[PDB]
Amino acid sequence: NPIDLTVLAEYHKQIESNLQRIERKNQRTWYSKPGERGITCSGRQKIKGKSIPLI
């Protein structure tokens, strides 16, 4: 009877597999490719300036 952390490896593999499934689904439906027509909108984001003192 030596020491044992097989349940630790199973738990860590379960965490890795569940996180890989969720992140694969999110990176599947957020960086998809639009088809035959192109990007149907535009980003249009612009940043203006401010008056920032320097004390």
* 25-32: long-range pairs with CB below 8 Å, 24+: none
Query: With respect to another protein, which residue has the nearer C-beta, 13 or 25?
Result: 25
CB 40 within 8 A of CB 34: yes
Minimum distance, C-beta of residue 53 to another protein, in the bound complex (Å): 26
Distance CA 52, CA 20 (A): 43
Q: Which is nearer to another protein, 4 or 50 (CB)?
A: 50
Which residues 26-45 are close enough to bind another protein by CB under 8 A? 30-31, 43-45
What residues make contact with another protein under the rule CB under 8 A? 30-31, 43-46
